[PDB]
XYZ file of C-alpha atoms in Angstrom:
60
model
C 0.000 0.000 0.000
C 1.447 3.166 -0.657
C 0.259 7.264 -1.481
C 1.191 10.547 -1.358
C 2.831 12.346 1.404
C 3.550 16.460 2.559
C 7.074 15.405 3.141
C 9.417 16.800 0.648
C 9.581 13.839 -1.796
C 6.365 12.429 -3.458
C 4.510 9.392 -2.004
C 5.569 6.489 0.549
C 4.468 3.456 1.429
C 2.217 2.209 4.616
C 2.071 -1.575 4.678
C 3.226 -2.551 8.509
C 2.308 1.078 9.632
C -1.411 1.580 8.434
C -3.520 0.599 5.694
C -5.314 3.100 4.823
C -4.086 7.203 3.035
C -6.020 10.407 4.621
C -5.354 13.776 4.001
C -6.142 16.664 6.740
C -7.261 20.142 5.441
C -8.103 23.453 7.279
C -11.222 25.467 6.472
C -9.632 28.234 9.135
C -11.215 30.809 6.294
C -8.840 30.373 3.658
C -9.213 26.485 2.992
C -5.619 24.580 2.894
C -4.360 21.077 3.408
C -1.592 20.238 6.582
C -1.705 16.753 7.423
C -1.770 14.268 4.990
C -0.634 10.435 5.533
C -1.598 6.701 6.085
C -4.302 5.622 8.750
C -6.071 2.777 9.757
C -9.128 5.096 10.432
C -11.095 7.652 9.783
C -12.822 9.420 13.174
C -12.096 12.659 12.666
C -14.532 15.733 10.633
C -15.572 18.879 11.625
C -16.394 22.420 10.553
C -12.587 24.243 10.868
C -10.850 20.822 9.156
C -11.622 18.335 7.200
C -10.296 15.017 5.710
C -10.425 12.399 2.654
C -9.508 9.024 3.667
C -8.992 6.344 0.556
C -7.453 2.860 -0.235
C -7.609 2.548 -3.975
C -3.832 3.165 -4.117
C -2.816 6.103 -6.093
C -6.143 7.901 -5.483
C -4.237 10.003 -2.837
């Protein structure tokens, strides 16, 4: 399993750690992604951040 990462590089992989890619963006006013890498969940959503979990494999 592997997708894309903020790091500076491209994408890594998430086998033994997780199995599962989410990304974490910010609706603070201005809208902008922060936090994006491999979970084996999904419980988070609100109104000031929000989050696309996916485990197609190069859908992230």
């Amino acid at each position: 399993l592997k997708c894309n990462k903020l790091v500076p590089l491209f994408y890594k992989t998430c086998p033994a750690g997780k199995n599962l890619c989410y990304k974490m963006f910010m609706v603070a006013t201005p809208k902008v992604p922060v936090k994006r890498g491999c979970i084996d969940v999904c419980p988070k959503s609100s109104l000031l951040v929000k989050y696309v979990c996916c485990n197609t494999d190069r859908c992230n």
